[PDB]
Amino acid sequence: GDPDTEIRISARISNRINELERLPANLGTYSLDDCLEFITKDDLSSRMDTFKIKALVELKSLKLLTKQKSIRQKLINNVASQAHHNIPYLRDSPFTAAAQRSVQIRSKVIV
Amino acid sequence: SLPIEDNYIREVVGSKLMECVNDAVQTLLQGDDKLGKVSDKSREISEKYIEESQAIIQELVKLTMEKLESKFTKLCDLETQLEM
Amino acid sequence: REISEKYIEESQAIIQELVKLTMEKLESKFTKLCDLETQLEM
Amino acid sequence: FQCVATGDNKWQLYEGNATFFNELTHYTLDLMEAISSYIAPAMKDDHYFQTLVSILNYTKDRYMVISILRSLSRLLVRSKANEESAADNLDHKTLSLIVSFLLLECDSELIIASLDFLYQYILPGSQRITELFKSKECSLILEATLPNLLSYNIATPDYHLLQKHKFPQELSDVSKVACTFLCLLSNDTDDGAGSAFCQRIRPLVLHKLADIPPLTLALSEYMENT
Amino acid sequence: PLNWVQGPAIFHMLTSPYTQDEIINHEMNFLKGRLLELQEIT
Amino acid sequence: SNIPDPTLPPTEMMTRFLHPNWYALPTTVWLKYGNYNSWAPSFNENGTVVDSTTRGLIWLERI
Amino acid sequence: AVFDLMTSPFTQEEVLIKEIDFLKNKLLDLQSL
Amino acid sequence: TQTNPVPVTYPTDAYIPTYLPDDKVSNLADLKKLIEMDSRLDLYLTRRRLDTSILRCSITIQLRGVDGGKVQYSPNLATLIGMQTGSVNDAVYSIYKYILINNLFVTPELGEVKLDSLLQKVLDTNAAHLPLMNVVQTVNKLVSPLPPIILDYAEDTAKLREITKLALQLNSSAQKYQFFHELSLHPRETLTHYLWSSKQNELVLQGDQYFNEDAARTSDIYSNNNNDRSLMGNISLLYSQGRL
Amino acid sequence: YNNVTLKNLTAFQLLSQRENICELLNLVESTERHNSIINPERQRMSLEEMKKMLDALK
After folding, report:
1. CB–CB of I6/F22 below 8 Å?
2. How many Cβ pairs within 8 Å bridge chains F and H?
3. H101 in reach of chain F (CB within 8 A)
4. If you count Cβ atoms within 10 Å of the first and of the last residue's Cβ in chain A, which end, N or C, has fewer?
5. B63 is in which domain, residue-wise?
6. Annotated domain spans of chain I
């Protein structure tokens, strides 16, 4: 709850997406470990895209946030909506076992 | 299992008594010398609730009477209305 | 306990005197009325 | 349950174990309600009849009173004409209470259930009409309630409108039960406890017959027995 | 004598309450939902 | 994609959960017949989980 | 709305007939109240 | 009132304990005498409440006393009854008794009456059989109103609720007696019962804590909670049914 | 509050179960809940109202 401090969260999330969406697409790396590989004039070293993958996992997970929310909505409301058929101490409580018995009482027939 | 907005949660947003009671009842159910000390403690408490019991019951006999006295004067009206 | 015990002991005598006296006056009003009822139905 | 329904200190029920016992005896009465018609040859000291009339003096459940009354009505179906548990085990503290439920005009299932057991009670009629017309309040409640139960929930043509200017064509469910017992009460021949009752009620029924033309087709055996 | 027959449609609802009044509306739609599919077989 | 942006007015994720530990249980049904029927069966219990005393005691310790 | 596979001395139509006899009473019981 | 009792939210006529040792109280049976005294008084009162009712211009003036207490009769309906202008309900009852004297129903056999000369005269019918519903229906037609002057040329519920509230206080002290009493009877198998049941009720109350607002929006439910094991094991089952 | 929950029933039971064990050790007082329901000045006032109802009805 508390939607005053909910805008102050999403204003920092949208701050981050608009900062990731101003980086150039041709971003490359240089580790201090490539001198053991002896890269030629055109050798295509395999450590060039170790910053470019991490900048797109970050940018795309900040857009699928309401996607895992819908799955976690469908996960929590499917494991907890029963709450008394799998949890043992709740199905072995007196009030739940009597109530699950009480809803299965068939109607009495008159004469 | 991915903490995505978990940092933004942490950015903006930065008993003992009954345990020792349950420990103590566990000690009373080891030595039966305390069970007599606990049963006799409960029995004067049982006698304490007996004095609690009839002090309510002696109020209920009184309060039944005034509500019954509301129906005596209702019944005494029928002595004259039926005889009319 | 003693102030409770003083008005727990005298009270039951005043309880069962009044309830029995209530049995007297109510049943006397009954037998007067249930016989006044029969003189109507005639 | 007879330990608690009487309040016997034999088997003082622990107060922590009462909820386990409450729903337990709820389904027991439902089993007793269904098999009561198969022990319809009820015995004189029928332990099911003896306990249930001790249970009936205790409860305040509207459902439980109905299930006891339906079992006792369906236990005394093909009883006798002389001697079964109906003629003697009704201790008149229970019997004055069943007629007392006809004063409950708000409920109507309890009126039908109290009428149906007494109809199953009245069917010998020898030691039954005299027993039902015995006391100064059991033979006196029926002089006011049973004529009033004929026009129960029936659209009588009113006259307050006709006094302040300045026909139902039907019956109800309990009125069909009310004329059924009263016509069998008119079959109390030789002027016993029923026809002597049925002669002091005929001046009151005749006013009800003019407002409801379905009360002319009904109460036919009563009008033949006056 | 064996007859491998299909079992009846048992109204097993996902959310499980305990009061009856939250069950009858879905059960009446179940009775409409089951007898209408059963009437066309006849 | 067909995903919405996470700066949407749905960002709530807990609105209509209603755990079955907060479900209403059927309790005893105290009836009323009239003002002068004190010999009526005062309540009704078909499939109630509790008795009328503790349901009255819960009513007593709440009212 | 869960079905089952089971053994019965009745065939499939008599179970459907017994479903007709059971559901019509429950339809008349629930629509009346 | 209804055809069914009216449910209420306050308790109605709570019970009285009987396992209480009555040697100490000695007033439960005397209070029990008051209740059956009051109910019998309520029985007689409710029975009594049921049994107390069981150019030349003309002068036209609409009077003040135009009332349906003495309502006018048709002259056919007048001579079959005898009275001049009595009432409408007495007109129905005297008509119904006149058929019942002449025994016209049968000797619908009871609906159809044998139409005599006067009954055919007052209804202007000529059938032999006619139902009594249509007979009494014309009595609503055959009666005309009276003509005007023409000149030409509680506390008991709250007392019950307080008694219901005070009886609930009695049920508390009786149960509080017997627990310690049966703990004085057996201190073993009510404290072993206590140390299990209070542990069980500690489990049941601690079954609803991982379902808050910011408890689920964070990831300390799914990640590393194999010690929890409760969820993230159903994903092999919920996906197998399509629940996602 | 007019209804009870499974949370409400267990909290009602556990609070009532822990207070009776809290009386044997007597680490709670429970003296306010005793004397206010005893109320011995009301108990004699109950007696004096019963005493006058002897005098009024005789």
Report:
1. yes
2. 84
3. no
4. C
5. 15-84
6. 2-58
